[PDB]
Amino acid sequence: TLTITFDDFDPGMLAGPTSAGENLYSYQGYPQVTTIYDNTPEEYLFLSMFNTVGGSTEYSSGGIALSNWNIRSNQSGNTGDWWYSYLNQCSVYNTAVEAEGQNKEAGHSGSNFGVVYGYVDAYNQAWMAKPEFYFNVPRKLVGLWICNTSYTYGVITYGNQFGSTGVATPLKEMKGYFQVNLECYDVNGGLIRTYKRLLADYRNGQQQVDPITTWDYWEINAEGVQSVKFNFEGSDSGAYGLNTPAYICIDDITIQ
Ligand code: CNC
Ligand SMILES: [Ca+2]
């Protein structure tokens, strides 16, 4: 058995100066981290790269960032919904850990963890692609730990607005659900199996699921996985698809 803990990855890969992760984008003046991995590009255990969508390579195109952030509250100077905004996208929501900011030992392992962003639905499927990672060779994927991001936790709990018209509704109110999917692929890129996990559920007397507030184990036991994709499904979905921020944090991936 091995565990990918993220804690030993190159610091140069850590998301942006602040918890907005300004270096996850081409255009904000920082060396942009498109690619994370454990050792070198030559010999790695794990590797994710940002997708390219309409010729543009960005965290929004779907991918996985390395983070050591755990802010879940308006820091000095921030107001309104800031702590569950995209300007704190990189933060894990972890209530088991009193101090908040950068390397505050808030992973299921140390300070570090992956932040998954992206999803595909009927509205964006023509252009968008799912976040993905790879093993260097096919592996038994035993399981992994997960936790919500402050952004996702917040918007589930309170909703928000975004852009001119965008509305996200609290899931308690509209009897909503939100789910993450872990899709395992084989050595030839064949789908082995898709794994589902409810992050929240308040549907009709369905077992109610409240969002986790600390790291929670996800048993998989998939054989011969070369690569993994993530998607999100949820019922908070209008004219332009899913409104709930399509993010999850990941730590301590166990393999053999
Ligand atoms: C297309 C799209 C969409 N996006 Co963008 C995505 N992917 N997005 C984009 C693109 C914008 C379009 C463009 N430049 O041409 C694109 C790829 C740049 C983008 C970017 C972002 N987006 C992001 C997110 C998280 C989201 N996006 C959605 C709005 C998400 C949408 C899904 C949805 N249900 O809305 C979405 C699929 C459709 C928007 C649309 O046309 N609707 C029309 C409407 C919302 O108002 P509008 O004035 O016509 O639309 C504008 C804004 O919505 C704005 N916009 C788009 N995304 C966001 C996100 C935020 C936080 C804000 C404040 C504005 C935007 O772009 C639109 C065109 O100007 C989102 C609901 C998807 C999701 N379920 O995760 C979600 C917001 C969650 C929430 N409740 O707040 C990013 C933070 C992703 C990231 N990891 O970086 C990022 C923020 C900007 C950046 N730093 O690059
Ligand atoms: Ca870790």
Residue numbers in the entry: 49 to 304
Per the authors:
In the human gut commensal Bacteroides thetaiotaomicron, cobamide uptake is mediated by multiple operons encoding outer membrane proteins, transporters and uncharacterised lipoproteins, some of which are incorporated into bacterial extracellular vesicles (BEVs). The previously uncharacterised BtuJ1 and BtuJ2 proteins share 23% amino acid sequence identity and belong to the IPR027828 protein family. BtuJ1 and BtuJ2 share a core jellyroll β-barrel structure, where the polypeptide chain forms eight β-strands organised into two four-stranded antiparallel β-sheets. In BtuJ1 and BtuJ2, the core structure is augmented by three additional antiparallel β-strands at the N-terminal end of the jellyroll and an α-helix located between strands D and E in the traditional jellyroll nomenclature (BIDG and CHEF).
The structure of BtuJ2 was determined using the same workflow as for BtuJ1. BtuJ2 crystals belong to space group P21212 and contain two molecules in the asymmetric unit. The structure was solved to 2.7 Å resolution, with reasonable crystallographic residuals and stereochemistry. The two copies in the asymmetric unit of BtuJ2 exhibit an RMSD of 0.127 Å across 211 equivalenced Cα atoms. There is considerable variation in β-strand length and loop structures compared with BtuJ1. When comparing BtuJ1 and BtuJ2, they exhibit a common core architecture (RMSD of 4.0 Å across 110 equivalent Cα atoms) but display significant differences in their loop regions. An interesting distinction is observed in BtuJ1, where Trp 78 is involved in interactions with the dimethylbenzimidazole group of cobalamin. In BtuJ2, this tryptophan is replaced by a pair of tyrosine residues, resulting in a modification of the interaction with the cobalamin side chain (d), which was sandwiched between the dimethylbenzimidazole group and Trp 78 in BtuJ1. Overall, while the shape, hydrophobicity and hydrogen bonding characteristics of the binding site are retained in both structures, the specific residues contributing to these interactions differ, reflecting subtle variations in binding mechanisms between BtuJ1 and BtuJ2. Interestingly, BtuJ2 was undetectable in cells but showed significant up-regulation in BEVs, highlighting its potential specialised role in vesicle-mediated cobamide transport.
